[PDB]
Design a protein around this ligand. Structure first.
Ligand code: E64
Length: 212
C-alpha cells in the first residue's frame, strides 16, 4: 500500500456534514464509507442518506447512538437512498425506505478490520474509506483546530467517524461536526505511537462495506 492515501483527491468523499445535537455519528460514518465504495466501484460520487440509517437501522438506537456495523449491514441487506430523496432532519423518525421508492445503491456485505492493528487499518484505507470510532469527549479533541492531533485523549471510544486517508504519521478522519471544526471538518490523527489502541482508541472498531 502507498505511503499516502487521500480519498478526497480520488473523488470518493462527499462534503463534510454536521450531525448537530443528534447522536447519529454512527450513521454518518457508515454513509461516508458507502459514498466512498460506490465511487470506487461505479465511478459516480453520490450522497447517501444518513437519515435512512438513523430511522431504519433497528439494531441501532437512533439519536441515542448506534453501531456503524449495523448500518453497513443494513445497506448490504436492503440498500440505501440518496441524501436528496431521504434528507437529514437531525431527529429519529419512522423508517421511510418503503415509501421513498427503490434504493439508490446496495452493497454486498461488511468486513471488519482486525482490531488494535494499525497496519490492518491502513491496508483497509488504501482500498476504501473505512468506518472507525474514537474518543471524542475530551476538550482537547472538541477544540481541535488543526495540525496532527496527538491528544491528550484516552481510549473510551464514544464517537464514530470515517478514515478517508493516511500518511506516514497520521490517519485522515472525516468528522461529522460541520465544515467549521478542525481542518475544514477533517482531523489528522497521529499514528505510529505504538499504542495498540491507537490515539483516542482509533483502532477499537473498524468496518468497511463490501461490494462485488
Ligand atoms: C455518536 C455521537 O453522536 O457522538 C453516538 O453517540 C454513538 O453512536 N455512540 C456509539 C459509540 C461509538 C459508535 C463507538 C454508542 O454509544 N454505541 C452504543 C449504542 C448507543 C448507546 N446505547 C443505547 N442504548 N442508546
Amino acid at each position: 500500500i502507498p505511503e499516502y492515501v487521500d480519498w478526497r483527491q480520488k473523488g470518493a468523499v462527499t462534503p463534510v456534514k454536521n450531525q448537530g445535537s443528534c447522536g447519529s455519528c454512527w450513521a454518518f460514518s457508515a454513509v461516508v464509507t458507502i459514498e466512498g465504495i460506490i465511487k470506487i466501484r461505479t465511478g459516480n460520487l453520490n450522497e447517501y442518506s444518513e437519515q435512512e440509517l438513523l430511522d431504519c437501522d433497528r439494531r441501532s438506537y437512533g439519536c441515542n447512538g448506534g453501531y456503524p456495523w449495523s448500518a453497513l449491514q443494513l445497506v448490504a441487506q436492503y440498500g440505501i437512498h440518496y441524501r436528496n430523496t431521504y434528507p437529514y432532519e437531525g431527529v429519529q423518525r419512522y423508517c421511510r425506505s418503503r415509501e421513498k421508492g427503490p434504493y439508490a445503491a446496495k452493497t454486498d456485505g461488511v468486513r471488519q478490520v482486525q482490531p488494535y492493528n494499525e497496519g490492518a487499518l491502513l491496508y483497509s484505507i488504501a482500498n476504501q474509506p473505512v468506518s472507525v470510532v474514537l474518543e471524542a469527549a475530551g476538550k482537547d479533541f472538541q477544540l481541535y483546530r488543526g495540525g496532527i492531533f496527538v491528544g491528550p485523549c484516552g481510549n473510551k471510544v464514544d464517537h464514530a467517524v470515517a478514515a478517508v486517508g493516511y500518511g506516514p504519521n497520521y490517519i485522515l478522519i472525516k468528522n461529522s461536526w460541520g465544515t467549521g471544526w478542525g481542518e475544514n471538518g477533517y482531523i489528522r490523527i497521529k499514528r505510529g505511537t505504538g499504542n495498540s489502541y491507537g490515539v483516542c482508541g482509533l483502532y477499537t472498531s473498524s468496518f468497511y462495506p463490501v461490494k462485488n
